Design a protein around this ligand. Structure first.
Ligand SMILES: O=c1ccn([C@@H]2O[C@H](COP(=O)(O)O)[C@@H](O)[C@H]2O)c(=O)[nH]1
Length: 256
């Protein structure tokens, strides 16, 4: 079991994964902020204040009421300044020919600003092939959704195994997983886990929470993704620091 810094140097590492792992090690953070807000100003103020505490900022561009490409330029300035990646949680899930256009084009031009995107595996490997046609030339990476945090998830058993095989067969572009646990035994792949809070509970629409210690320490994931546990708190900086310290110590204690 290797440190993030050592995993950044693995022979088969993807450049996006390497950049991420190096800044995780440098900044002692394995926290991804889920910036689930509707105002550009709030997104940018969170990115600036929490930038030092996070390895990654996850977006849902399609809920920003005042999206423009200039907002994403300003977010990139902050990502470069504070050293974090931008992950658009778009969950591409269509045929290859369609997702290529949804990734490159339209109003959002996701591929122009997102270091990482993700995809569901249910359509078969054409979803990855279509994305990679845009993402490989743009030096991007992708995460496959192997497990989900929500009640009634069908991403279990053979489905999870299919996601791992699809990732391991598209390693030029796929850099890891959305999962609740370590699902790949190959250390070149990242594991990012949403459904994380310090306290037990859930929401009223099927979200289920587990703690950083559970998902990083016991379940062997790499990165926690935290939305409301930070966003709904009064002091979002202190909340981010609490989640960062929790995830980082769970990782260290796992390492030995
Ligand atoms: O299995 C998954 C994959 C993605 N997300 C996303 O991660 C965030 C979780 O936010 P919260 O429940 O921490 O507020 C949301 O943006 C949600 O869309 C999940 O919650 N579960």
């Amino acid at each position: 079991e290797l440190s993030f810094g050592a995993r950044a140097e693995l022979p088969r590492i993807h450049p996006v994964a390497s950049k991420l792992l190096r800044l995780m090690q440098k900044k002692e953070t394995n926290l991804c902020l889920s910036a689930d807000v509707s105002l550009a100003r709030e997104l940018l103020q969170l990115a600036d204040a929490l930038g030092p505490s996070i390895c990654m900022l996850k977006t849902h561009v399609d809920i920003l009421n005042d999206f423009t490409l200039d907002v994403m330029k300003e977010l990139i300035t902050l990502a470069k300044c504070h050293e974090f990646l931008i992950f658009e949680d778009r969950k591409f899930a269509d045929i290859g020919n369609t997702v290529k256009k949804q990734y490159e084009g339209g109003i959002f031009k996701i591929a122009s600003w997102a270091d990482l995107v993700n995809a569901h595996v249910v359509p078969g490997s054409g979803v990855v092939k279509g994305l990679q046609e845009v993402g490989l030339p743009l030096h991007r990476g992708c995460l496959l959704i192997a497990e989900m945090s929500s009640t009634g998830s069908l991403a279990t058993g053979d489905y999870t195994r299919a996601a791992v095989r699809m990732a391991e067969e598209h390693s030029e572009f796929v850099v890891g997983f959305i999962s609740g646990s370590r699902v790949s035994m190959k250390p070149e792949f990242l594991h990012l886990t949403p459904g994380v809070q310090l306290e037990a509970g859930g929401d009223n629409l099927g979200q289920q929470y587990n703690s950083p210690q559970e998902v990083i320490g016991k379940r062997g994931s790499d990165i926690i993704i935290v939305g409301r546990g930070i966003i709904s708190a009064a002091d979002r900086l202190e909340a981010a620091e609490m989640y960062r310290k929790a995830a980082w110590e769970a990782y260290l204690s796992r390492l030995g």
